Amino acid sequence: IMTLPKIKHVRAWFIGGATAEKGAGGGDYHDQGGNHWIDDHIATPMSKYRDYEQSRQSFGINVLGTLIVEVEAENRQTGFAVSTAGEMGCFIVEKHLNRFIEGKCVSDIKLIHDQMLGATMYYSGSGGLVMNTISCVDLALWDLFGKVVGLPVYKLLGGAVRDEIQFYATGARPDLAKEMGFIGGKMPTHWGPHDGDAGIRKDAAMVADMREKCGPDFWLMLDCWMSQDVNYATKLAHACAPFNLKWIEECLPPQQYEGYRELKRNAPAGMMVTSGEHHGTLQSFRTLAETGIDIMQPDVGWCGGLTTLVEIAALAKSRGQLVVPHGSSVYSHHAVITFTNTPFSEFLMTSPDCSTLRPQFDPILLDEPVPVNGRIHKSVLDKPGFGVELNRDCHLKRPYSH
Amino acid sequence: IMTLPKIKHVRAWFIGGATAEKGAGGGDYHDQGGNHWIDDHIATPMSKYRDYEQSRQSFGINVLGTLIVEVEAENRQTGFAVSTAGEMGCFIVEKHLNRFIEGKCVSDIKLIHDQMLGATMYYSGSGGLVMNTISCVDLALWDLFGKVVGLPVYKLLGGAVRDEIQFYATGARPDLAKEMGFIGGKMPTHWGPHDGDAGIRKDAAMVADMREKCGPDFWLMLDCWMSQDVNYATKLAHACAPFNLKWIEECLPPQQYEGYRELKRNAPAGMMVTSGEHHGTLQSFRTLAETGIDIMQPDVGWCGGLTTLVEIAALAKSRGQLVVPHGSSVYSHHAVITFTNTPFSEFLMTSPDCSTLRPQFDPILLDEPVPVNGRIHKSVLDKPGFGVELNRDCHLKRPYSH
Ligand SMILES: O=C(O)[C@H](O)C[C@@H](O)CCCO
Ligand SMILES: C[C@H](O)[C@H](O)C[C@@H](O)C(=O)O
Ligand SMILES: [Mg+2]
Numbered sequence: 001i002m003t004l005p006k007i008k009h010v011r012a013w014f015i016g017g018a019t020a021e022k023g024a025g026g027g028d029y030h031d032q033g034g035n036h037w038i039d040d041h042i043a044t045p046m047s048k049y050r051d052y053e054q055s056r057q058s059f060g061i062n063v064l065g066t067l068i069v070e071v072e073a074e075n076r077q078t079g080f081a082v083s084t085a086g087e088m089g090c091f092i093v094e095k096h097l098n099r100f101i102e103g104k105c106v107s108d109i110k111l112i113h114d115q116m117l118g119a120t121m122y123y124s125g126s127g128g129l130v131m132n133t134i135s136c137v138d139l140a141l142w143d144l145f146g147k148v149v150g151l152p153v154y155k156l157l158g159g160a161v162r163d164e165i166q167f168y169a170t171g172a173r174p175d176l177a178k179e180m181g182f183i184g185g186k187m188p189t190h191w192g193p194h195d196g197d198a199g200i201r202k203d204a205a206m207v208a209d210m211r212e213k214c215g216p217d218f219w220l221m222l223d224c225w226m227s228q229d230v231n232y233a234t235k236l237a238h239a240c241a242p243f244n245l246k247w248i249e250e251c252l253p254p255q256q257y258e259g260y261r262e263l264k265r266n267a268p269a270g271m272m273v274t275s276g277e278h279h280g281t282l283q284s285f286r287t288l289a290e291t292g293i294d295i296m297q298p299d300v301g302w303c304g305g306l307t308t309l310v311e312i313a314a315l316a317k318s319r320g321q322l323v324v325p326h327g328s329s330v331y332s333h334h335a336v337i338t339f340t341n342t343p344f345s346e347f348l349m350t351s352p353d354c355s356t357l358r359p360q361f362d363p364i365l366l367d368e369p370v371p372v373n374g375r376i377h378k379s380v381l382d383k384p385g386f387g388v389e390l391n392r393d394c395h396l397k398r399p400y401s402h
Numbered sequence: 403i404m405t406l407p408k409i410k411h412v413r414a415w416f417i418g419g420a421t422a423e424k425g426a427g428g429g430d431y432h433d434q435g436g437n438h439w440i441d442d443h444i445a446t447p448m449s450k451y452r453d454y455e456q457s458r459q460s461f462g463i464n465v466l467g468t469l470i471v472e473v474e475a476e477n478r479q480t481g482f483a484v485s486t487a488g489e490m491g492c493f494i495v496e497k498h499l500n501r502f503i504e505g506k507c508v509s510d511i512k513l514i515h516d517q518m519l520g521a522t523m524y525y526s527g528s529g530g531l532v533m534n535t536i537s538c539v540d541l542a543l544w545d546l547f548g549k550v551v552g553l554p555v556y557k558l559l560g561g562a563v564r565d566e567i568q569f570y571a572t573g574a575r576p577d578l579a580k581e582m583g584f585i586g587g588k589m590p591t592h593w594g595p596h597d598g599d600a601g602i603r604k605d606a607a608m609v610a611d612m613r614e615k616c617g618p619d620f621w622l623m624l625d626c627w628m629s630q631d632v633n634y635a636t637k638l639a640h641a642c643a644p645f646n647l648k649w650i651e652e653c654l655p656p657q658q659y660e661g662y663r664e665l666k667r668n669a670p671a672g673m674m675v676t677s678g679e680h681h682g683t684l685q686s687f688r689t690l691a692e693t694g695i696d697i698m699q700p701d702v703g704w705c706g707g708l709t710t711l712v713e714i715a716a717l718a719k720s721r722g723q724l725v726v727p728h729g730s731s732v733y734s735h736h737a738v739i740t741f742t743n744t745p746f747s748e749f750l751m752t753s754p755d756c757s758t759l760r761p762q763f764d765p766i767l768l769d770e771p772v773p774v775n776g777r778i779h780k781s782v783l784d785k786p787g788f789g790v791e792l793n794r795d796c797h798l799k800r801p802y803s804h
């Protein structure tokens with residue numbers, strides 16, 4: 001029998017965010033610099049305001065920054081993970097959650113997870129900031145466990161059900177993505193309800209243009225980042241039907257379950273409606289799944305962690321729905337390669353102009369895998385835990401201790 | 403016409419919490435000391451764990467502490483409010499929300515509220531910590547506006563619809579509350595699902611005992627603080643029917659809307675099922691209301707603020723449902739005294755043994771009204787804003803600035 005060490009320490013750091021260096025990248029996808037496609041007039045719940053229409057950074061989409069959680073075993077072996085939470089995330093880990101982590105066996109992952117959810121239920125809001133923090137701890141624990149055992153997380157889960165992961169790319173250049181080998185391209189909408197018919201015409205024209213440039217089989221999708229209402233989303237969906245838009249994503253704020261049910265009913269035949277990247281907790285996904293949307297897209301570092309993601313996958317599978325996680329790099333790779341119902345995955349372009357394969361969490365992860373010709377072979381993931389190391393060269397800050 | 407000043411500064415402080423003095427009380431109801439009824443073997447989602455069964459403080463119900471938000475107008479007049487968020491709440495106000503507040507007219511309350519919701523949607527989780535912070539800002543704004551205009555918030559809202567507010571008391575001593583003049587007493591359950599039939603027997607016996615001591619007309623209620631499941635809650639509800647328990651509260655975690663619908667259907671005839679203190683955003687309450695529960699109980703400082711509470715009241719009223727806010731002291735008083743569908747209100751005993759009328763938010767609020775003979779006359783609320791001043795004698799800490 002294999003002997004397992006206990007967890008000795010848990011520590012949290014952060015980079016980027018309102019109290020560090022702006023544009024640090026890493027865990028917080030939106031903590032970028034200037035002239036980045038990911039901040040180029042993207043439609044949001046705030047773009048109806050003139051002062052917040054051109055830039056998401058202007059309303060503060062980058063204030064949190066990156067949270068880094070590292071768990072150390074008694075034998076000095078360590079595991080870690082990153083997510084979006086920054087300094088406040090550090091407070092939660094160092095001043096609250098540490099009590100459930102330290103002293104546990106490295107294999108007590110599900111126990112620690114349940115205790116974190118139970119202990120923070122009174123202030124977690126079942127999603128967002130607090131759940132991002134819990135997710136980061138969960139991932140760090142899986143990483144440590146796999147590194148202690150000497151196995152990649154995907155093998156601990158029951159092995160891969162496919163030899164490689166195929167990706168679609170999210171960014172402003174589906175055409176460049178096709179050249180890179182991706183199977184599809186998801187573009188962000190730039191106009192919203194306040195833009196009316198003109199907004200619909202413009203975003204639909206954007207899709208029409210890429211359809212002409214990419215061909216019929218390369219998938220095209222629209223990401224709406226919680227910026228619409230049912231009527232606008234319905235009009236946009238129908239305006240894009242002629243171009244065989246594969247799916248229209250997150251048209252509504254997360255609490256609007258009833259609206260998603262209506263939107264899905266109104267959707268053009270064969271066109272999928274998706275959401276989920278901002279939802280958290282298994283129970284929320286149960287409610288989301290029952291709205292009838294085609295694909296739920298939890299972010300492994302935001303939905304509650306790998307422990308929760310695996311449950312969401314089972315939920316979707318029981319209903320014949322697909323689960324295609326939001327970004328997440330290796331944290332998603334090790335999970336989805338084992339999911340029969342995750343036939344493809346997402347790669348969110350961190351490259352300012354979507355012309356290069358800059359790593360998903362650049363530069364916080366050392367040796368971070370990137371799709372080559374739109375794919376990541378399972379052999380690439382054949383390393384202990386999630387297979388990466390923390391880039392200690394980054395200016396990590398430790399705001400709290402215990 | 404009256405001239406209104408612009409908002410010049412917004413500042414956040416905190417007391418209590420994991421990074422200050424434990425047991426500070428104030429905004430965080432649970433940041434108490436030892437031997438307090440509010441921490442006496444209260445059933446929770448964590449009490450199934452032996453190490454966290456006896457005390458909620460042990461699992462960290464007190465790590466956040468009190469958040470204090472003060473908004474200052476150009477004319478030097480100030481308004482403020484308190485809630486549960488502490489240090490992290492300060493980060494959110496000083497490093498993110500300040501951009502939507504400063505520079506606005508003191509009357510731009512609803513605008514600032516919508517911008518706070520839109521700008522934090524990507525990490526707010528629609529409730530909990532972030533929403534508590536937003537609520538605190540909202541309340542501070544109403545306070546400032548009323549103080550600038552020279553009117554109590556309840557008059558700005560459209561006046562009182564009753565001359566006094568009648569209260570029920572939450573605590574371990576319904577009998578002592580009856581002597582104090584309260585119209586009812588809500589007790590916390592001490593056992594949970596893991597305790598099975600014995601747990602049900604014990605909490606039901608507790609209700610039976612108070613029914614014998616208090617008489618038939620004094621109301622009795624059970625608060626279950628998200629600690630049960632549908633079957634346990636159903637059994638407990640039926641076990642308490644013989645004693646005419648008025649309602650059984652928050653039996654399930656907030657995301658379990660489907661469970662609440664089932665619980666309400668299973669409830670004994672005439673017995674009410676309530677929840678809502680941990681829910682946030684108007685949309686969540688729409689979903690909650692549709693489960694059919696009888697009373698929604700948002701906390702003004704957690705649900706999104708006064709701006710949101712007024713909307714929730716309209717939602718409930720449109721359906722014939724009642725809205726009875728969770729604690730909140732003056733922040734609830736000024737709102738509910740104007741609600742036709744809030745016939746009574748709650749006073750959560752901060753007194754360690756529920757024998758005295760220690761102020762709801764003691765000691766952070768100066769001149770904080772307390773029910774006298776179970777009531778608060780509207781004349782008591784006849785002061786600008788929410789009618790109270792910040793107890794600057796407390797050891798307020800300013801972790802962030804901008
Ligand atoms: O699904 C995703 O990769 C994210 O939602 C992309 C998002 O950050 C860009 C805004 C699109 O409207
Ligand atoms: C005593 C209970 O656990 C809560 O702290 C009280 C709260 O839920 C209320 O409704 O007052
Ligand atoms: Mg998306």
Ligand SMILES: [Mg+2]
Pocket residue numbers: 625626627651652679728
């Ligand atoms: Mg309650």
